[PDB]
Every structure is written in structure tokens, then in C-alpha cells.
Amino acid sequence: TPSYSLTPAEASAVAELTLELAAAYGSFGDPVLLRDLPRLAARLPEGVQDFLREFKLADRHGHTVIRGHDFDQRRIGPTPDHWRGRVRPGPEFPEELLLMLYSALLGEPFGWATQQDGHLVHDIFPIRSHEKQLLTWHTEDAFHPYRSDYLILGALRNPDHVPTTVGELDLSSLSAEDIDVLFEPRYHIAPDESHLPEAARFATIQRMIDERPLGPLLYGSRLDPYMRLDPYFTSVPQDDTDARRAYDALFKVVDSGMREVVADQGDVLFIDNHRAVHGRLPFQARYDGTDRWLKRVCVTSDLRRSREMRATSATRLLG
Amino acid sequence: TPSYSLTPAEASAVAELTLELAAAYGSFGDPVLLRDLPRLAARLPEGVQDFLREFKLADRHGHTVIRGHDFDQRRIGPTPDHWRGRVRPGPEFPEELLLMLYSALLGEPFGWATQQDGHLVHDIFPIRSHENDQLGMGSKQLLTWHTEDAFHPYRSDYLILGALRNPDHVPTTVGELDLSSLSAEDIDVLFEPRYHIAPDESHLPKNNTIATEEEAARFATIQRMIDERPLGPLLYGSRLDPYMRLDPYFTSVPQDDTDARRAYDALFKVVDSGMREVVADQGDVLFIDNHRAVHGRLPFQARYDGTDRWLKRVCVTSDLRRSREMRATSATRLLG
Numbered sequence: 001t002p003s004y005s006l007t008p009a010e011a012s013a014v015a016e017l018t019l020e021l022a023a024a025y026g027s028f029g030d031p032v033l034l035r036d037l038p039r040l041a042a043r044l045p046e047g048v049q050d051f052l053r054e055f056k057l058a059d060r061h062g063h064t065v066i067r068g069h070d071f072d073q074r075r076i077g078p079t080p081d082h083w084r085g086r087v088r089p090g091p092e093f094p095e096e097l098l099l100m101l102y103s104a105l106l107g108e109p110f111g112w113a114t115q116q117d118g119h120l121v122h123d124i125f126p127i128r129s130h131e132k133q134l135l136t137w138h139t140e141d142a143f144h145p146y147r148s149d150y151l152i153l154g155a156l157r158n159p160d161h162v163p164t165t166v167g168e169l170d171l172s173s174l175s176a177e178d179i180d181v182l183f184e185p186r187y188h189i190a191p192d193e194s195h196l197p198e199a200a201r202f203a204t205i206q207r208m209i210d211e212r213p214l215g216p217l218l219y220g221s222r223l224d225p226y227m228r229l230d231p232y233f234t235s236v237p238q239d240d241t242d243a244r245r246a247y248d249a250l251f252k253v254v255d256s257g258m259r260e261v262v263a264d265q266g267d268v269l270f271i272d273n274h275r276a277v278h279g280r281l282p283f284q285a286r287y288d289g290t291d292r293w294l295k296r297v298c299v300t301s302d303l304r305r306s307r308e309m310r311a312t313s314a315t316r317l318l319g
Numbered sequence: 320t321p322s323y324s325l326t327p328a329e330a331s332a333v334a335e336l337t338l339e340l341a342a343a344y345g346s347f348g349d350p351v352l353l354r355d356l357p358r359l360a361a362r363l364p365e366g367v368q369d370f371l372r373e374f375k376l377a378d379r380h381g382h383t384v385i386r387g388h389d390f391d392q393r394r395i396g397p398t399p400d401h402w403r404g405r406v407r408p409g410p411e412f413p414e415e416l417l418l419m420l421y422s423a424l425l426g427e428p429f430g431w432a433t434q435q436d437g438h439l440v441h442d443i444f445p446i447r448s449h450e451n452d453q454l455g456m457g458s459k460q461l462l463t464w465h466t467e468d469a470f471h472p473y474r475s476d477y478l479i480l481g482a483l484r485n486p487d488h489v490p491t492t493v494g495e496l497d498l499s500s501l502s503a504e505d506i507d508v509l510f511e512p513r514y515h516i517a518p519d520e521s522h523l524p525k526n527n528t529i530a531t532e533e534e535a536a537r538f539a540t541i542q543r544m545i546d547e548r549p550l551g552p553l554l555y556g557s558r559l560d561p562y563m564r565l566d567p568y569f570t571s572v573p574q575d576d577t578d579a580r581r582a583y584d585a586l587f588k589v590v591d592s593g594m595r596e597v598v599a600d601q602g603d604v605l606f607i608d609n610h611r612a613v614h615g616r617l618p619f620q621a622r623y624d625g626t627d628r629w630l631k632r633v634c635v636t637s638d639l640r641r642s643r644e645m646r647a648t649s650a651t652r653l654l655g
């Protein structure tokens with residue numbers, strides 16, 4: 001699994017640009033910043049731009065890491081208690097812009113209007129409110145047609161080196177019979193809540209909600225398939241024994257191949273949501289302000305494909 | 320409808336940059352060039368970058384034109400007699416690079432394996448043996464307006480057309496949807512899966528091979544579109560400002576569906592009357608949104624003497640991996 005370790009000169013250049021930008025624009029609420037994102041990402045060190053582009057175009061790896069960023073722990077400040085009510089942007093603005101810059105290189109930043117006030121940059125930290133743990137891995141929003149194409153995970157801090165799980169598909173473990181079956185529309189994948197704590201917009205998912213259609217788990221090339229796998233929300237008709245058998249074998253190949261990948265401070269982990277499932281590992285949280293803190297941006301390759309679920313042309317928020 | 324006029328200064332920098340990249344890269348066969356494209360595009364004048372980014376993001380206009388490029392006629396040379404058997408890249412390599420830089424700003428360049436040997440930038444000039452054809456390389460026959468590859472799920476999102484020369488100012492026809500000209504009932508019908516769109520014959524899995532497991536699976540989706548003949552909408556996206564897919568020649572309105580026939584006739588009439596003649600003169604680069612505009616071309620008499628109208632064409636996709644099932648490898652930008 002390829003990775004890129006920045007030089008101090010690269011790390012410094014990245015840090016500098018990140019601060020120059022964090023002072024030129026007020027927030028992501030500025031339309032001009034979202035507009036300038038690709039031009040702005042072009043000022044990043046060439047080696048970093050080239051590394052990401054090769055990852056994008058190779059379409060071979062489920063994840064990659066850019067390591068060795070300079071995240072100013074003094075400036076960033078303590079790990080917050082909650083995301084809500086908290087005024088944006090904070091002192092970690094520079095780090096969020098970086099993740100936004102990387103997103104502009106892979107495609108387009110987008111978010112969920114009902115997820116974290118619809119912030120384009122997501123917070124990942126321990127909260128006592130939302131506090132025998134099961135080890136679950138998944139494709140992000142596997143049911144959704146407009147699910148992320150990439151996930152960007154930038155580690156602001158991870159003092160106890162708490163790993164992220166990430167698993168890819170090994171095709172040589174599956175039979176040609178199972179592969180073909182998985183390519184066919186024989187599986188139900190349930191939606192997810194995120195409700196509470198415009199006629200044509202909401203009535204779009206009402207095909208997946210009312211009718212409940214069957215889709216495939218593998219797609220794309222049959223020699224090197226993409227996948228949509230969330231075992232918790234996956235259903236197979238009882239009478240379809242071939243699909244149940246093939247889904248079982250797919251689960252077993254993916255579960256047994258799960259890797260543990262640590263996003264340490266200064267790392268940015270890139271996950272291909274079509275080639276890799278991922279998950280979280282349970283950990284003891286301190287709540288003092290020194291806890292593990294990651295930021296998260298969802299990337300869509302095709303902004304316009306989700307138009308019908310978006311309030312206007314301009315907004316990058318779905319729902 | 321917005322356009323961007325280059326200053327002679329901007330046109331000079333663009334030209335210089337294209338010459339520079341033409342010298343530094345071998346051809347479009349070099350995978351480093353395709354990789355470098357967007358970073359390279361960031362070296363274009365900033366105005367142009369802002370203009371195109373605003374077009375892309377606005378998602379409102381069906382077309383735009385960047386006018387006033389310096390296309391050196393002496394360097395470019397005679398309009399070729401055929402695309403087959405040319406040294407590649409030719410002397411017009413700087414212009415082809417330009418359209419590829421532009422496509423990287425809008426999305427990713429891609430091509431069709433069957434089309435002109437899979438060249439990502441392809442030619443639009445008269446070929447004598449193609450005189451009676453209703454195609455791009457024709458001349459005498461009217462190229463009637465349409466959405467490009469209306470049937471295809473992985474059809475172009477955008478089209479980039481650069482005019483190397485147009486001595487007789489032969490216009491490209493382009494038409495958009497005026498939604499206010501249609502009744503709310505008609506729009507609702509056009510939004511529903513009530514229409515059959517036929518594939519162009521170059522897309523038929525029985526036309527191109529096929530034979531062996533790997534290639535059969537590469538046309539499995541098209542094959543089941545042909546076998547099942549699913550009905551689909553002609554208008555999609557937002558009901559307040561919809562995307563369209565309209566190729567009159569390949570559209571079948573089921574005979575029994577009287578509401579669909581009324582709404583289709585309504586939609587056709589609106590688009591046909593709104594048709595605009597847009598002249599892509601020398602140094603003009605035409606951008607067409609394949610989801611908001613149809614396009615065609617008026618008939619013209621060719622000369623076949625090396626002085627004929629010559630355009631370069633790039634197809635742009637917003638999502639290269641969406642068409643992965645139809646591409647031989649992960650790296651290839653050729654469908655089929």
C-alpha cells in the first residue's frame with residue numbers, strides 16, 4: 001500500500017499555504033473559497049499533487065496515507081466536548097482547509113445537511129453524550145446512490161495510536177460463480193436514520209424507502225470489482241440460496257482480510273469508498289482535551305449527479 | 320449566454336504555454352501527461368480558470384465560448400485528407416493540448432474505442448469518402464441536432480470543440496431548454512420513465528466484439544438495455560431547472576402513451592424553435608453541456624484542398640470510474 005512522506009520543506013510549505021488561506025477567506029461559508037479550491041490546491045507541493053492524482057487514476061488501492069504534516073498542537077488547542085453550538089471556524093481552520101484542498105484534487109467536497117449541522121468538514125472526537133464492543137466495518141452509506149466516492153481522514157491527534165480498520169477485496173479467494181451472483185440485483189440494503197437529533201427533494205429516496213429495490217454488491221469490472229458492503233444493513237431473500245451463499249463468502253473474504261491502519265498525528269488517510277470498507281476500534285476516552293481528534297471530508301467525483309436531492313445548484317449539501 | 324473574450328496578452332500566454340507543453344511531452348499516449356493535466360491547466364490565465372469553474376459550478380447555461388485564441392495557421396498546416404495514417408501527434412499538437420487542459424478543468428477527458436482509433440482529441444474535417452454520411456467527417460448532409468449518445472448511461476457530460484479553422488464561418492447549431500415554454504403537466508410526464516431511446520449502431524454489442532469472457536462482461540449493461548428495452552425519462556435532475564436527453568432520431572414514444580406523445584411534441588417544438596446558430600470561428604473554443612444543450616451542424620460544401628473547416632473535439636466525463644465496467648483496464652480512458 002503506497003504512501004507519501006512529506007519532507008520538512010514540503011510540510012512547512014503545506015503549513016504556510018494552509019495559514020495564508022486561513023486568513024484570506026473567513027470560512028467555508030464563502031462561495032469564492034469553494035470556487036477557488038482546485039486552483040488553490042495547485043499551489044500545494046507538486047509531489048503531493050502528483051501522488052494523489054496517481055492514487056485517483058490508478059484505481060487499484062482502497063486507501064492511501066500522506067504522512068508527516070505539521071499540525072500545530074498549540075494553535076489547534078484542546079479537543080472539544082461537542083460539535084454543536086461550537087462556533088465555526090475554530091483555530092484548526094488551517095487543517096480543515098487542507099482536507100478541503102485534498103478533496104478538490106480528488107473531486108468535490110460534499111456533505112449531509114442532517115449530519116453535524118451540514119458542515120463540509122466533520123469532527124471525530126470522543127463525546128460523553130454519545131458514549132461489550134463489536135468490531136464493525138462498512139462501506140460508507142452503502143445503500144445510497146449518492147454515497148461518497150472517497151473519504152478523507154486527517155488526524156489532528158491520536159495520542160494512544162488508536163487504529164482505523166480498512167479492508168479490500170481479494171478476488172482470488174472467491175469463485176467465479178459467487179462473483180457473478182454478487183454482480184446481480186439480488187440484495188436489499190437498508191437506509192439509516194440521522195433524523196431530528198421540498199416536495200420533490202425528500203421524495204427521491206422514497207424508491208428505496210417504499211418499494212425497497214434489490215441491487216448488486218459487486219459492480220464495475222468483473223476482473224477488479226468495486227463493492228458496496230454494509231453487513232449490518234444487508235438483507236438477502238430467504239428463497240435465494242445462491243445469493244446468501246455468495247454474500248457469506250464475500251463477508252468472510254472481507255472480514256478475514258481486514259487491516260489495522262493507524263492515522264497518527266500529521267497523517268491524512270484517504271479511503272476509496274468503492275474499493276475499501278472501513279471501521280472504528282473501541283478505545284478508552286479521557287475527555288480532558290487531549291483525546292484522539294480527526295477531521296473528515298466526503299468526496300464526490302460527480303457533484304451534479306446528486307442535483308435532485310440538493311436544495312439549489314450551488315449547495316454541496318444533500319437532504 | 321456568457322462568453323469569455325481573451326485579450327491579446329492572454330491569448331499570447333495560452334499559446335506560449337501550449338507550445339511549451341508540446342515540446343515537453345511526447346503525445347497523449349504518455350500517461351504522465353494525462354496525470355499532469357489539471358496541474359498544467361492551473362498555468363492558464365486566471366480569468367479563464369475562474370470563468371470555466373463558474374460555468375461548471377453554476378450548472379445553468381447549456382453552452383459557453385472562450386473566444387480569441389491565437390491558433391498559428393502556418394504551424395498548424397493544411398487540413399488533412401483523413402484521420403487515418405497521420406503522424407501522431409501532428410503539428411497542431413499545441414491546440415489539442417489546450418482542449419485537454421480545458422477538459423481537465425471541467426472533468427476528465429475520455430473517448431470511445433471505436434471512434435477515430437481511440438484518440439482522446441479527435442478531428443472534425445471533411446473526408447471525401449464520407450461526403451454522403453450524416454456524421455462529423457461529413458459536409459453535404461445536415462447534421463441534425465441532438466444530445467450526444469442520449470441512450471448511453473456513460474455519455475459525455477460536456478463537449479469541447481476547438482476551431483482550428485472555419486474559413487466560411489459554418490455555424491454549429493446549439494439549443495437549450497426554455498422550461499417556461501412547457502406546461503407543468505408536460506414536465507411531470509417528461510420526468511417519468513415513459514420513453515425508449517435507441518442506441519447508435521456503434522454502441523451495439525453485436526456490432527463490435529465481444530468474444531471471450533472479459534469483453535462480453537464489458538457490454539453486459541448495454542446488452543440488457545437492448546434485451547429489456549427499459550423506458551426512461553427525457554428530463555431529469557431538478558424539476559425547476561431540469562437536465563435533458565433529447566435525440567429525436569433515436570427516441571420512441573410508445574403508441575399507446577398519449578400523454579407522453581403530447582409532452583414529447585411539446586418538448587421538441589420548444590427546443591427546435593430555440594435553436595441557436597453559434598459560429599466557432601478560428602481561435603474559438605466551444606463548450607457544450609451535454610445535459611443542458613443539444614447540438615448539430617449546418618450543411619456545407621467541402622473543397623478537399625487542405626483549406627477546409629477543421630475542429631478538434633474532446634469528450635468530458637465528470638466521473639471516469641462510473642464507466643469502469645466498459646473499460647478494458649483501470650488506466651484506459653477508452654470505453655469499449
Ligand SMILES: [Fe+3]
Pocket residue numbers: 138139140278
Ligand atoms: Fe463510516
